[model samples]
Target chain A: MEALVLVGHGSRLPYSKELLVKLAEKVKERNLFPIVEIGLMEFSEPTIPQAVKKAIEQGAKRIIVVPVFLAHGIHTTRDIPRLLGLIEDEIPEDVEIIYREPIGADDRIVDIIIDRAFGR
Target chain B: MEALVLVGHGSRLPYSKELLVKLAEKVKERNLFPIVEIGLMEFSEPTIPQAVKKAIEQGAKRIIVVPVFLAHGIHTTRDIPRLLGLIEDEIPEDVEIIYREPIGADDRIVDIIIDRAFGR
Candidate 1:
């Protein structure tokens, strides 16, 4: 089956992980993907490899990775892709990996941020 | 002319708003929009109305509001829209208000989160 892994920057703030986890739950609630997991890039546990390993262990053959960022900063442009590259080499050669773009620079995202403020 | 207001869900643990503010600065640096402002939904200073008013006072006639949230839960679905509804009539009638959707469920967002986790 296919699985979705949600990635966050992982903040030390008390509620940061809570909110990100909540977001993952909400996404799962939508039932858009078969398997859903949350992982942090830093300042938290259950890093990328761990999340991918868990998914692979759960019988996920196709993995879809999602980065919960607002733009194509260093995290998106460099950090995350490197982690995934390692995971792919470490995981089963049969596992299929598909990567999407960063959340930043999307016009829809700009619209969403604007809507959150203006309410229109 | 036009202004952008970025709203983030405030966290007391520290650095939550800092990241959001940083995101705002990056957006401003891109210079895609004319004016940009940052505000907190709660648990922080300078609430929504204050941000909006500040934007108006700074010579913004049209405002684009963006919610730096992950989903369309209570905050995005109800509270924020209600706040904007109240602020509209109170502000300049000529001010053109446009609201975008919540930042969740965006394909790019998912990719960014994933890329952050599994960098190349």
Candidate 2:
């Protein structure tokens, strides 16, 4: 089975984590991944390793990380990879780990921004 | 005239600023607002006040700031506003400055994430 880990830049404020969890629930509802979990880079629960462990527990043979960031930054380019590297051995021998791109100039995001700014 | 300013959390990496400029260009092509500008919270050029001043120069009577952040944290809630406060007097007395909500739990964002995660 394949699983997805939605990574977010967590905040001390509850709102950031709240919406991230909500996004995970929405992704879960869509049934895109057999297992959908959330991971926070800082200031919150379910750290990346913890989330990956949950996926493993759910029988995920492959795990893909999808960063929930608006643009690619150090967090996407360095921090996340470094975190995954720290846990290189902890991952099961059979599980495959894949890292995907952050939301970088995706046209859909432009539309959303327009709506948020003007569409009421 | 009205303007749209897309505020981003800048990075040391050039990619972040490049994509933000691209988003601003896309928004400009759409002609949603007569003037569209890009602003960086930190580390990059055309800071929030600079963008707003550009809008004002473009004959904008009102300016709406759309944060490109995934979630609202201190940057949105406190930092950006504080920056704007510093420029309050710089703004023309007749110009209106409206700060819109950041991209919260909008359904479109979820759809985009799904596409980014599984599709193609």
Candidate 3:
């Protein structure tokens, strides 16, 4: 079965981490995917490497990494990809790895942001 | 003049911080508002307090604190509001402070996210 791994840029702010965990749990409750996991890349728990390994152990033939970030600047273009490169050869060559773009760069998001600010 | 302060779930990852800066600059170029500043809370440069002070010193009469985060679990619901409370009275009563919703939970944003994930 395919697995969806939600990765976030972790924070030392306990609140920040708490929010992500809550979001992950809510998404997991949907149970749309065979497996879903949440993880942080650095300065947080269950890092990318660890999450990736866990997904592999679950017999996931394909893993999709979705970064819950807001922009497409450097993190999406460089850092995350850099980290992925290190693990390129370790996973089963047959097991596919797919990386999605950051949550930002979505044109529709601009409107949503405005709506959120003025909704109340 | 009114100002926009773009806050993010700061990361030690240089790339993550860099992306925020780039996004801020791009937004500033839009000139949608009189001023825009980007800052990090922790594990990054120019902490929240510093950014707020700078915004005030710049003669901002109204400040919109836009969180560049993905969820509303805690940072948006509590920590940020708590921090804002501290300096609430310091700023000019005429100088209002508006806190926007977190980037997630915006219905339109979901579409943007989906597009980013599966787009060509």
Candidate 4:
């Protein structure tokens, strides 16, 4: 099975975690991946390692890690990769890891922001 | 003049600021508002106050502030409101400030994320 892990830069606020968990639910509802998990980079449960471990346990042969970040910041660029590096060696050699780019400057994101600003 | 202020959680990385600037440019290109400015909540230039000041100086009588945040975290729910509160009273009586919600679980946003994940 292939899995998808959506990562968020978690915050101390409960609202932050709520939204991330909601996003994962939304993604899971689509059934795009057999296993879908939400992971927080900091200050929350189910960190990247935990989520990845769960995916593997669920028989994931390949996993895609998507950072639910607005842009390429330190969290997306450096910290996340570092965190993942710690667990990469623990994964089975057959299981592949595909790290996708953070949600950067997508046209759809711009559209959504405009609509939000204009109340559309 | 009506203006749009895009607020971002600023970061130490140049890449982070670059994306916010780019998003503002994209919004400006649409010509939705006479003035489009990007503000940082922290760690960068053009704080919310600075952006609001610029908008007012540009003859804006109405400003719509849209957070470039992915969700309602402490920065969006608490820090940003605290910062905006300082400038709210200084504006002219006629100038309206509309603080929109952060980018929440919009279906378009989820669609974009899926597309990004699948390379669509």
Interface RMSD of each: 7.0, 1.6, 4.2, 1.2
lDDT of 3 by residue, B3-113 (tens): 777777676566557756766666655557677777776688776656766788898977888877776645666667666673343334567778877765444544443
TM-score of 1: 0.54
Q: Which ten residues in a row have the lowest lDDT in candidate 3 chain B?
A: B85-94
Ordered by DockQ, highest first, the candidates read: 4, 2, 3, 1
What tens-digit string does per-residue lDDT give for candidate 1 at B16-119? 56756777776776667778888787787767777888889999988777778664556666677777773333355778766666565544444444444345
TM-score of each: 0.54, 0.93, 0.62, 0.92
Q: What is the lDDT, from 0 to 100, of the residue B23 in candidate 4?
A: 92
Better of 2 and 3 by DockQ: 2
Of 1 and 4, the candidate ahead on DockQ is: 4
| Residues forming the 10-long window of minimal summed lDDT in candidate 4 chain A | A84-93
lDDT by residue for model 4 over A35-91, one digit each (tens)? 998889889998888988889899998888888888888777778877777333234
Docking quality (DockQ) for each candidate: 0.15, 0.72, 0.29, 0.74
lDDT tens string, model 2, B1-120? Answer: 888989998888887788889998888888667888999989899888899898899899888889888888988988898777733324557888888888787788788888788644
Ranking by lDDT: 2, 4, 1, 3
* Model 3 lDDT, residue B25, Cα: 66
For model 2, residues A15-119, the per-residue Cα lDDT tens digits are 888888999888778765778899999999989889988899999987888888877778888889878773332456778878877778878878889888974
Model 3 ranges with Cα > 4 A deviation: A29-32, A73-79, A86-90, B1-60, B71-94, B104-111
Mind giving the per-residue lDDT tens digits that candidate 1 earns over A1-120?
Answer: 888887777765534466568667766666667788877888877787788888899999988877765544566656788888833324457787666554544445554454455454
RMSD of each: 8.8, 2.3, 5.2, 2.3
